[PDB]
Amino acid sequence: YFTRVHKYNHVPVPFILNVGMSISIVTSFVYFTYTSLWVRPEYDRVVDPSKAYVN
Amino acid sequence: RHPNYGVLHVPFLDALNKEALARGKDGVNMGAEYNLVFTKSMADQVVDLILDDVQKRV
Secondary structure: OOOOOOOOOOOOOOHHHHHHHHHHHHHHHHHHHHHHHOOOOOOOEEOOHHHOOOO | OOOOOEEOOOOHHHHHHHHHHHOOOOOOOOOOOOOOOOOHHHHHHHHHHHHHHHHHOO
């Protein structure tokens, strides 16, 4: 017998656990991709051509 | 070619253009060529010879 074929041993995920895991993973990915690639304020530039100095 | 951070740098010739226009002189040409003929050395030599003659026969 091939006892690990698709038709055998399917365990559905409870809806509550499915929702909780989905929310957790989506939140984590969104938060990380945001705070890493979007909230990057050290890349600051100032546009002021009058701050040049030539003797 | 990403512009630098901190304080955005101003090209030196732009700064000189602004400076020269502030003092009333003409701005940077950006297209003027060199004086290949009749160089600074030739001009200085001509000045030298006339200065020598005028000083000699003061």
